[PDB]
Symmetry: D2
């Protein structure tokens, strides 16, 4: 698993479940080509987005639909979505965990990049 996303809810102290997101790769014409998507599990995680062979160097965007999440909970949110844009694999294949911590008017995101 070269890429995993984990989403937590700072209001409820829980994984953020059923959060949709899309992953894009930056094309040669500077546009965003969709390539993977999913929604978070009961543990707030999304696995199996890509494979080692497919996940080549490039610029990637993860667009997390935080607005629909807060809407489902009846809370008015600030952001349309949370976006995480990064260059991958600049020194060869790494495992990437992108974590996002969500509040109605704030989000934080961190990357844990390991072997």
């Amino acid at each position: 698993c070269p890429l995993m996303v984990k989403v937590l809810d700072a209001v409820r102290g829980s994984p953020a479940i059923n959060v949709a997101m899309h992953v894009f790769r930056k094309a040669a014409d500077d546009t965003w080509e969709p390539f993977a998507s999913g929604k978070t599990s009961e543990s707030g995680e999304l696995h199996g987005l890509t494979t080692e062979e497919e996940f080549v160097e490039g610029i990637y965007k993860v667009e997390i639909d935080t607005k629909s999440y807060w809407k489902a909970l009846g809370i008015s949110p600030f952001h349309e979505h949370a976006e995480v844009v990064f260059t991958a694999n600049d020194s060869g294949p790494r495992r990437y965990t992108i974590a996002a911590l969500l509040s109605p008017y704030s989000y934080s995101t961190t990357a844990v990049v390991t072997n």
Copy 2:
């Protein structure tokens, strides 16, 4: 102003100075149109991006060039930029402060929204 951005550096315990950012507004055809741009001051703040009359209802994107910031300090960071996308003024005019706290592999962003 109706829109201000404040950026702090969590590694050095300081404002994040001379950070470039571009603001965009979503057009009727769903494209991002340039709206304003600027760089943070010595206090890590960027003021004067817009006016109450120009800052109409809509979806706005602030793209903060965090990568250039870190690269200039010798650091290769994780993110290309920090992106803040929000609907503004949907229930009448508001004042918006977007705050961002930066680390090489993490950032946090919050908004303070006040009624004029």
Copy 3:
């Protein structure tokens, strides 16, 4: 001032108003001695805690009463308080802004340290 605290609320997108906090300083015998206290203003800020002459070198603790804040909004939060412990003025006088962003199950805190 040499010491200011700013508190924001991540649930409401606002300053965190009327938040109580107590500042302590470590004594020679390793106990925490009361140093100053106050509550945040409508802008979520607490100023005037100390002076440059009183704010000598030492280890300081700011205990922010985040639980009472959330309870007054109807929320049962995770933390009892947010605690910020730091050595101050070790290399001569500095100005310290302690910032905290609050959510019911999370908080973040950063410092801005500037040379007078």
Copy 4:
């Protein structure tokens, strides 16, 4: 495992390894009684701090020695430590994960409280 602590490094994008911490419970005389401690693993996690029977309702403090961590890396840090003080089990036994994300002049902490 009723209580787990996970520590991440926001400068390096990695688990924060070998970070020491102590856990205290608030005594009847308003003082902090030590009861558990450890250091984080290669995954930045500390498990096995307590058991279901021992981890009764009360006020708990986790004192994370972030200053020694940054010192080992040659980076001057702001905080003496990061402290997490919470009331446990107020509605019966829950599993608690305390996460802390560290930078030299900042830390964030979140709780994920599940079944």
